[PDB]
Amino acid sequence: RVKMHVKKGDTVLVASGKYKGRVGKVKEVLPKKYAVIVEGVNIVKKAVRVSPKYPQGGFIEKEAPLHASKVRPICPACGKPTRVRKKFLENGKKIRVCAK
Amino acid sequence: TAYDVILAPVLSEKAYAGFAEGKYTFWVHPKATKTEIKNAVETAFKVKVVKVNTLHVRGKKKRLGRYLGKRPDRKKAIVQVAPGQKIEALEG
Amino acid sequence: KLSEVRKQLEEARKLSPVELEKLVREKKRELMELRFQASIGQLSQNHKIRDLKRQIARLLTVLNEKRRQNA
RNA sequence: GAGCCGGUAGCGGGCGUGGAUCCCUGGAUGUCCGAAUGGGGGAACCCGGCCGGCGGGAACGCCGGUCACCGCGCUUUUGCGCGGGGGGAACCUGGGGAACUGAAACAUCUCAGUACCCAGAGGAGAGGAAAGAGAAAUCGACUCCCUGAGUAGCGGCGAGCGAAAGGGGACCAGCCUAAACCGUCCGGCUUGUCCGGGCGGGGUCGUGGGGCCCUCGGACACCGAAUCCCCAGCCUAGCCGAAGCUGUUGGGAAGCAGCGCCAGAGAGGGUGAAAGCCCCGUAGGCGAAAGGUGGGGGGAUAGGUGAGGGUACCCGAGUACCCCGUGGUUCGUGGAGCCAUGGGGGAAUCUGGGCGGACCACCGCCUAAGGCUAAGUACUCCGGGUGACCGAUAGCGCACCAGUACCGUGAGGGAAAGGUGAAAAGAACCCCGGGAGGGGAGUGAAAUAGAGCCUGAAACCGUGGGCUUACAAGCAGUCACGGCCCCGCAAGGGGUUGUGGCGUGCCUAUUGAAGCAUGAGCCGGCGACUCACGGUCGUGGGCGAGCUUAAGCCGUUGAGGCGGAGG
RNA sequence: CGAAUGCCGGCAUGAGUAACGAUAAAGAGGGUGAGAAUCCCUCUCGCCGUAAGCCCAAGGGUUCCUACGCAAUGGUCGUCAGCGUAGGGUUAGGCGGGACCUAAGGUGAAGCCGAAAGGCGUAGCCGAAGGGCAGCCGGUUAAUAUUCCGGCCCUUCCCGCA
RNA sequence: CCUCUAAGCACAACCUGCGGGAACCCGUACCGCAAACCGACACAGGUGGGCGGGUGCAAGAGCACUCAGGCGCGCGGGAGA
Lengths: 100, 92, 71
Ligand SMILES: [Mg+2]
Ligand SMILES: [Mg+2]
Ligand SMILES: [Mg+2]
Ligand SMILES: [Mg+2]
Ligand SMILES: [Mg+2]
Ligand SMILES: [Mg+2]
Ligand SMILES: [Mg+2]
Ligand SMILES: [Mg+2]
Ligand SMILES: [Mg+2]
Ligand SMILES: [Mg+2]
Ligand SMILES: [Mg+2]
Ligand SMILES: [Mg+2]
Ligand SMILES: [Mg+2]
Ligand SMILES: [Mg+2]
Ligand SMILES: [Mg+2]
Ligand SMILES: [Mg+2]
Ligand SMILES: [Mg+2]
Ligand SMILES: [Mg+2]
Ligand SMILES: [Mg+2]
Ligand SMILES: [Mg+2]
Ligand SMILES: [Mg+2]
Ligand SMILES: [Mg+2]
Ligand SMILES: [Mg+2]
Ligand SMILES: [Mg+2]
Ligand SMILES: [Mg+2]
Ligand SMILES: [Mg+2]
Ligand SMILES: [Mg+2]
Ligand SMILES: [Mg+2]
Ligand SMILES: [Mg+2]
Ligand SMILES: [Mg+2]
Ligand SMILES: [Mg+2]
Ligand SMILES: [Mg+2]
Ligand SMILES: [Mg+2]
Ligand SMILES: [Mg+2]
Ligand SMILES: [Mg+2]
Ligand SMILES: [Mg+2]
Ligand SMILES: [Mg+2]
Ligand SMILES: [Mg+2]
Ligand SMILES: [Mg+2]
Ligand SMILES: [Mg+2]
Ligand SMILES: [Mg+2]
Ligand SMILES: [Mg+2]
Ligand SMILES: [Mg+2]
Ligand SMILES: [Mg+2]
Ligand SMILES: [Mg+2]
Ligand SMILES: [Mg+2]
Ligand SMILES: [Mg+2]
Ligand SMILES: [Mg+2]
Ligand SMILES: [Mg+2]
Ligand SMILES: [Mg+2]
Ligand SMILES: [Mg+2]
Ligand SMILES: [Mg+2]
Ligand SMILES: [Mg+2]
Ligand SMILES: [Mg+2]
Ligand SMILES: [Mg+2]
Ligand SMILES: [Mg+2]
Ligand SMILES: [Mg+2]
Ligand SMILES: [Mg+2]
Ligand SMILES: [Mg+2]
Ligand SMILES: [Mg+2]
Ligand SMILES: [Mg+2]
Ligand SMILES: [Mg+2]
Ligand SMILES: [Mg+2]
Ligand SMILES: [Mg+2]
Ligand SMILES: [Mg+2]
Ligand SMILES: [Mg+2]
Ligand SMILES: [Mg+2]
Ligand SMILES: [Mg+2]
Ligand SMILES: [Mg+2]
Ligand SMILES: [Mg+2]
Ligand SMILES: [Mg+2]
Ligand SMILES: [Mg+2]
Ligand SMILES: [Mg+2]
Ligand SMILES: [Mg+2]
Ligand SMILES: [Mg+2]
Ligand SMILES: [Mg+2]
Ligand SMILES: [Mg+2]
Ligand SMILES: [Mg+2]
Ligand SMILES: [Mg+2]
Ligand SMILES: [Mg+2]
Ligand SMILES: [Mg+2]
Ligand SMILES: [Mg+2]
Ligand SMILES: [Mg+2]
Ligand SMILES: [Mg+2]
Ligand SMILES: [Mg+2]
Ligand SMILES: [Mg+2]
Ligand SMILES: [Mg+2]
Ligand SMILES: [Mg+2]
Ligand SMILES: [Mg+2]
Ligand SMILES: [Mg+2]
Ligand SMILES: [Mg+2]
Ligand SMILES: [Mg+2]
Ligand SMILES: [Mg+2]
Ligand SMILES: [Mg+2]
Ligand SMILES: [Mg+2]
Ligand SMILES: [Mg+2]
Ligand SMILES: [Mg+2]
Ligand SMILES: [Mg+2]
Ligand SMILES: [Mg+2]
Ligand SMILES: [Mg+2]
Ligand SMILES: [Mg+2]
Ligand SMILES: [Mg+2]
Ligand SMILES: [Mg+2]
Ligand SMILES: [Mg+2]
Ligand SMILES: [Mg+2]
Ligand SMILES: [Mg+2]
Ligand SMILES: [Mg+2]
Ligand SMILES: [Mg+2]
Ligand SMILES: [Mg+2]
Ligand SMILES: [Mg+2]
Ligand SMILES: [Mg+2]
Ligand SMILES: [Mg+2]
Known about the structure:
It is classed as ribosome. By secondary structure, chain A is mostly beta strands.
């Protein structure tokens, strides 16, 4: 409620920092941290094993969050902002040119 | 509301010890009456209750961090069933 | 659950007082049945408990509206 | 409109575009206590009556109804209906009402009808349509602001206290009754054509009004609410919103660079740093099924629409009025009126009665002893918007799980405590160790950002080094040489101190202090000549026989104008 | 800001100083453990015993029992604890209170009084460690027991029958 | 509690047998002359009632020793001013 932003479980372009350029999908939006997931900013997390179960632990791990701002959606063209159309009975987010 | 009186079985060395005789102990509504419990138990587990003992169980005071509190107070009811009768559900 | 939820209000709304009270009695026992298992471990699908706790809330909520005129 | 199952991570389970979580509105549920109200009681607990239902249920228990008291009205009563009771930060009215202080003692006086206690009322409260003001051939309810005015006056005429009129503004409003007189119902009784109670009509005023007579009478003719109805608007969720890419430095661009773009938007915040065009927004513009609010605009009602001449019937009683005791006002006994009134005495109905500061006569002003009445004004628990306001010893007592911890029997008192990083990436694993803690490894731009972790000063405690000290003696320094060590090519400079010379801490308070007079353990942080309105000089300007506005109004929303009451 | 026996905080000095809380008193051998004069056991020794033993009421509020534990709290130490985490544990017709009674006092229908607040006050009501009222002896748990179990013995209600 | 009778009611009712049922709420751990209560503390202080054995001393709840039980006091080791 209001806590809303620009992306959802779709395809985006990173404009950020370490991954400026990188492109990825479903960022499992938070937005308590106002971040997304994508496929970059993935750090190595140490592991002892939260309980012997699943013994050994490595260093290649998971993908970290990314401030929602560092990313830009894309469809039938490239980066670019998002607009909103009424669909004659709806409200779908459309891009200035393409449409989603 | 008959199933609102009996909250759950107690489960503990001492409690089980009762099972030999028709002695089943339960966690019941803090306000529940001995008579209220007798009925509750009869219709719930289909048995004949002949004795009912109850005792209050003050909640243990606990502390997680600088935050101090207590656990909810409770009532324990140990109902005795008519000769040779078992509350199936509590056996095993 | 949302779907299987928009039913009761209907499949339960059309019955009357004597039909519900008994239905609710049934549910209340089922709830006992549950909370009775957890205490021992068995049951763990929590979702079930809270799910049943709220069902009763509905039946009662519906029965409370019926007992205000009707026939 | 895509994520959700609060602060939630976690096991262990689930829901959602067939549209959840979430937000707004209305309802449902709402254990116990609490005005607490069935009774009781050491608040949150006990115990009942009556009616109905659960269980074998008559003993027992639970569940749903229902039972306090007081006041109005109906009315005998039995009962029935409406209401009342508490809470509320300030604000408001009423009933009571200090003292320290000030008077350089103190009692009248002051503080002050203040602080406080009590009752009541509400979004306000109070006040309110002249028995007024007071000198004007005057004004014309009340409240509120500015002037009037520190005036008039009061005062042990000491301290000090302190009006009204008028003028300029805000706002606007005016009505209902009592009684003459006429009708009705009820109860008294002497059934008297009367007593009095309730209704209804009539009547509301001061250039006097009304009643009752008699003339005039020709109104679907005008007024019109403060009441009701409906609308707009407003409030309680939201929504739409222009324009940037690339390179480069770098952990990271938003910096810098190249070439663009939007602007009714260049307020602001965020995004690894500094961004109009990445994100949220901003200008501008939309939005309510439901609940509030709402003559602002419409209506509809209740209610109101006359002259002449007669009569003299009626115009608010333990009242006016006078005296005694007091309060209010600027008025403290004063020449003491006016307005209230505890006591005593005690009228009249306009051929009346009050007032114009004793009193009297003139001339005038006004109609007491019944009630109601929006707006302008006050306040801020709450929501919002701003700041030459604070920035964790500050700002609220609380930036943090604070009216808490702790204290006290109780009323009551009342703390401390904020910051890892961009991101937990919160350090696997190995090594010493029981652990703690470390050393490696690893993360990161940074780990002396490693976790009560940004920066991290001073006091204080250490390790290492340089100079220097066991025949010297001192407010511990200073001046002079000399030795050793350290810089630079040099001249020169830095550190230390062996001799020599000279030397009575700091503050305060005093005639006089090293003083054996005061204060200070040391360090860090907090800590004391301000502000308002008057006054008096001086000074920078403007205008000057003049100068200047106050409240308030119109404008802006960091824009100023107007306003001559007044001084 | 340098001073106010200033205010808040921090850290010094005295200082390895006085103290370590009754002069009833210790010794040893085993055990446990990373480590214990300080925990466990055994054997000696000393103290209290109108107790320094046992039980009840008040007050206290889990301090009870048990398993893991030792940073801190314990005036030393700690493997131990009244300490940390967690799980258990308190069973009543007859014991004590309440579904009884009244006491001082309190409250309070009637009723009295007072600017308000409120002060009295008959009946009633509340009020106990007083009056009334039916359970004694054993056995069991790590932890309750006239409460659970056993034997013996009672009390009120309700219904039926005579 | 026994008894007396008023309203009432006497096909109620009470009373004694005997059978068959009914009998709720709270407390109950633990400390309790103390290291768990009141004294900021594991404080040599304060804290109401009951039990409180044996032998001896004239007696006793006195005194000395001891049963049952409980303890040697929650820093020690030395030194011989
Ligand atoms: Mg829609
Ligand atoms: Mg019990
Ligand atoms: Mg949480
Ligand atoms: Mg959760
Ligand atoms: Mg709602
Ligand atoms: Mg009550
Ligand atoms: Mg009461
Ligand atoms: Mg009944
Ligand atoms: Mg009211
Ligand atoms: Mg007042
Ligand atoms: Mg007053
Ligand atoms: Mg007052
Ligand atoms: Mg005085
Ligand atoms: Mg004086
Ligand atoms: Mg005065
Ligand atoms: Mg208002
Ligand atoms: Mg008003
Ligand atoms: Mg107003
Ligand atoms: Mg008038
Ligand atoms: Mg005026
Ligand atoms: Mg009349
Ligand atoms: Mg009229
Ligand atoms: Mg938008
Ligand atoms: Mg935009
Ligand atoms: Mg850099
Ligand atoms: Mg760039
Ligand atoms: Mg620059
Ligand atoms: Mg920006
Ligand atoms: Mg910005
Ligand atoms: Mg740019
Ligand atoms: Mg807008
Ligand atoms: Mg509406
Ligand atoms: Mg007359
Ligand atoms: Mg006076
Ligand atoms: Mg006077
Ligand atoms: Mg008088
Ligand atoms: Mg008089
Ligand atoms: Mg007069
Ligand atoms: Mg007069
Ligand atoms: Mg006069
Ligand atoms: Mg006059
Ligand atoms: Mg005169
Ligand atoms: Mg006049
Ligand atoms: Mg009048
Ligand atoms: Mg009048
Ligand atoms: Mg009024
Ligand atoms: Mg008014
Ligand atoms: Mg205001
Ligand atoms: Mg503060
Ligand atoms: Mg700071
Ligand atoms: Mg606050
Ligand atoms: Mg503070
Ligand atoms: Mg205290
Ligand atoms: Mg590195
Ligand atoms: Mg840092
Ligand atoms: Mg920083
Ligand atoms: Mg630091
Ligand atoms: Mg330092
Ligand atoms: Mg050194
Ligand atoms: Mg010599
Ligand atoms: Mg020498
Ligand atoms: Mg010298
Ligand atoms: Mg002096
Ligand atoms: Mg001098
Ligand atoms: Mg000296
Ligand atoms: Mg001195
Ligand atoms: Mg002196
Ligand atoms: Mg001094
Ligand atoms: Mg001194
Ligand atoms: Mg200092
Ligand atoms: Mg300082
Ligand atoms: Mg001035
Ligand atoms: Mg001046
Ligand atoms: Mg200082
Ligand atoms: Mg100074
Ligand atoms: Mg100081
Ligand atoms: Mg200090
Ligand atoms: Mg020292
Ligand atoms: Mg020494
Ligand atoms: Mg010494
Ligand atoms: Mg010594
Ligand atoms: Mg010593
Ligand atoms: Mg000791
Ligand atoms: Mg000692
Ligand atoms: Mg001895
Ligand atoms: Mg002895
Ligand atoms: Mg003795
Ligand atoms: Mg107790
Ligand atoms: Mg504890
Ligand atoms: Mg223990
Ligand atoms: Mg152990
Ligand atoms: Mg220790
Ligand atoms: Mg423990
Ligand atoms: Mg009683
Ligand atoms: Mg009284
Ligand atoms: Mg009495
Ligand atoms: Mg009584
Ligand atoms: Mg008693
Ligand atoms: Mg007794
Ligand atoms: Mg025991
Ligand atoms: Mg028995
Ligand atoms: Mg009961
Ligand atoms: Mg016990
Ligand atoms: Mg003692
Ligand atoms: Mg005793
Ligand atoms: Mg001790
Ligand atoms: Mg003691
Ligand atoms: Mg004693
Ligand atoms: Mg003898
Ligand atoms: Mg003797
Ligand atoms: Mg012994
Ligand atoms: Mg001790």
